[PDB]
Design a protein around this ligand. Structure first.
Ligand SMILES: CC(C)CCC[C@@H](C)[C@H]1CC[C@H]2[C@@H]3CC=C4C[C@@H](O)CC[C@]4(C)[C@H]3CC[C@]12C
Length: 65
């Protein structure tokens, strides 16, 4: 769940830094950027649907109506 370990001139030892928040560790060397249709979960690998909210009957801004 943490990509972009960039290899130096020698292809043996790498430095690992976090990718972007909206990006993924889908592959070892690819940040996937899962689309806006669904939000990253706790682990940065694998997409997860966004929770949905609606007009709640107990909404504080729906008392006077
Ligand atoms: C007492 C209730 C059930 C009926 C009468 C409600 C009337 C008086 C209206 C007039 C203005 C209204 C408030 C206007 C704005 C807010 C801020 C919001 O973040 C929570 C609800 C709250 C606090 C409303 C509550 C209901 C309210 C006080």
């Amino acid at each position: 769940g943490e990509r972009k370990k960039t290899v130096k001139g020698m292809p043996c030892c790498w430095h690992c830094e976090p990718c972007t928040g909206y990006q993924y560790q889908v592959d070892r060397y690819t940040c996937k950027t899962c689309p806006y249709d669904m939000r990253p979960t706790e682990n940065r690998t694998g997409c997860r649907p966004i929770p949905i909210i609606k007009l709640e009957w107990g909404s504080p801004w729906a008392v006077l109506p």
